[PDB]
């Protein structure tokens, strides 16, 4: 089908490919993996240091095997060879993953990474052509409460949720603020992360969500939100909504959250065990009643 | 529930239960659209395999008829043919000689062109879309599938502009001007536009538009349209082979839309 040129690369071209990103700092690497096999065609010399891994081991892994299993689905979704910009018009959408250095399921430490993916072709000949590849610019990220430390007036993030109180969207600013990746939140319920003493508050919030539909956004009472290291952070939030213009019902609820405290353990990404068993009791109670009150048109 | 059995269906619907961490389909309903075999991720079109995995990842699946399920789509077929199918994936558990599996049960519905066999009523030829300030599709409702020929995965991430008749594209500038002007008000109509269905032929779309404005950064966040096809396309099967398959001259248009859509309101 009448196609424009590709720009094909080869193995020695890959050494320099995004040296601008790889020189940014000591947390960045570039990986190129084949859409055919899932194997690494090129990865930066510094990636063994950054993943705490070994150069040999990595030239022979499938990239996905490095990924935390929670993240494999976002990986496949965000790297589909069909959404991908080519590599230089609007182009390049960040996702997140935890990636380990592939140790031995005991010494395996996952760090969170921010990824920019691009499409690329390389070298050899199969039955037709030169190798479709993903170019991945990777960067280790840090808890917003360490080191640098996101300034206080910048500790803001945005989320949206369904009338069923299920998260639809979370902007990337949340990640170093809460220690979760977007995929951890999407499809889960906001109520789960809330302090129990604070969940009933959502009732009045969604009542205001109706009252103020078509009106500017409102504030209410702060709520404690559980970061992934387990400690709570106080959200000071503004809320509003989008009502479907045709059936005038609330389609989603939107929050801009100012994070007003810091946890004690400054590392929101610290490894934690947490029991996820029995707890959806008062949760379905609130979800059911909030949903219910939200069918009132307009 | 925890067993080894059955739910049947019928008439361009059938069930494939397949082995989870495994491969081979356990069960398959006596109904077979085109020639037997005994394999299943294998029956999918190249470009659909990514969706088939996303929507059937064991964690996303709900339990069967519990005490809830959401569609995805693929083309899941000389050599080959490929039809469109609507799917509902579930997690269930099955017995074998191998001392309970993990098991995904899927209910599969062959999809017809809204125009072919049992045509969709004219009053029901409505669907909705959303796109960014940069004219890229974010959301497409299922009801677009039988009407355009494309599965949502073909359209999400691509540009509205691409699909519009070149004759019709520059209405988009004005349609976006009105979006700013009618921001905060109920939907508006503007001149219609023609949309290139998957087979090659165009249809007229009569639409209303509105938008969602970010409440803090007072700029348009996305644009929503509800559309109604006026007129059957030249070809019946909106899914049929498709003939005239390059073109640019779009990019400038989208910078213009994107630039004008920067105005806070």
Swiss-Prot record, chain B:
Coverage span on the entire protein = 119 to 411 of 1113
Tell me the ranges covered by the PAC domain, including all copies: 190-233
Residue interval(s) of motif Nuclear export signal 3? 253-262
Self-association or partners: how does it assemble? Homodimer. Component of the circadian core oscillator, which includes the CRY proteins, CLOCK or NPAS2, BMAL1 or BMAL2, CSNK1D and/or CSNK1E, TIMELESS and the PER proteins. Interacts directly with PER1, PER2, CRY1, CRY2, and TIMELESS; interaction with CRY1 and CRY2 is weak and not rhythmic. Interacts with FBXW11 and BTRC.
How is expression of this protein distributed across tissues? Answer: Widely expressed. Expressed in heart, brain, lung, liver, skeletal muscle, testis, and at low level in the spleen and kidney. In brain, mainly found in the SCN, hippocampus, piriform cortex, and cerebellum. Lower level of expression in the neocortex. Expression exhibits synchronous oscillations in liver, skeletal muscle and testis.
Question: What is the stated purpose of this protein?
Answer: Originally described as a core component of the circadian clock. The circadian clock, an internal time-keeping system, regulates various physiological processes through the generation of approximately 24 hour circadian rhythms in gene expression, which are translated into rhythms in metabolism and behavior. It is derived from the Latin roots 'circa' (about) and 'diem' (day) and acts as an important regulator of a wide array of physiological functions including metabolism, sleep, body temperature, blood pressure, endocrine, immune, cardiovascular, and renal function.
PTM comment:
Phosphorylation by CSNK1E is weak and appears to require association with PER1 and translocation to the nucleus.
Q: What is this protein called?
A: Period circadian protein homolog 3
Q: Which domain of life is it from?
A: Eukaryota
The species is Mus musculus
């Amino acid at each position: 089908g009448r196609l424009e040129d590709v720009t094909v690369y080869s193995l020695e071209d890959l050494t320099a490919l995004a040296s601008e990103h790889t020189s940014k700092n000591t947390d960045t690497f570039a990986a190129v993996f084949s859409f055919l096999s899932g194997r690494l065609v090129h990865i930066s010399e510094q990636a063994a240091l950054i993943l705490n891994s070994k150069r040999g081991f990595l030239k022979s892994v499938h990239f996905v095997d490095l990924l935390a299993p929670q993240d494999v689905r976002a990986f496949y979704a965000h790297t589909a060879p069909t959404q991908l910009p080519f590599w230089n018009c609007a182009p390049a959408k960040p996702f997140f993953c935890r990636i380990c250095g592939g140790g031995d399921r005991e010494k395996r430490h996952y760090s969170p990474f921010r990824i920019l993916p691009y499409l690329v072709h390389v070298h050899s000949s199969a039955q037709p052509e030169p190798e479709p590849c993903c170019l991945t610019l990777v960067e280790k990220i840090h808890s917003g409460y360490e080191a640098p430390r996101i300034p206080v007036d910048k500790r803001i993030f945005t989320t949206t949720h369904t009338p069923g109180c299920v998260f639809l969207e979370v902007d990337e600013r949340a990640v170093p603020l809460l220690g979760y990746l977007p995929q951890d939140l999407i499809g889960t319920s906001i109520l789960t992360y809330l302090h129990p003493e604070d969940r009933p508050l959502m009732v009045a919030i969604h009542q205001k969500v109706l009252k103020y539909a078509g009106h500017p956004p409102f504030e209410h009472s702060p709520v404690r939100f559980c970061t992934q290291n387990g400690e709570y952070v106080i959200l000071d939030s503004s809320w509003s909504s989008f009502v479907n213009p045709w059936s005038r019902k609330v389609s989603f609820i939107i929050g801009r959250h100012k994070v007003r405290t810091s946890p004690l353990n400054e590392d929101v990404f610290a490894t934690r065990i947490k029991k996820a068993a029995s707890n959806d009791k008062d949760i379905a109670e609130l979800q059911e009643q909030i949903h219910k009150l939200l069918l009132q048109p307009v």
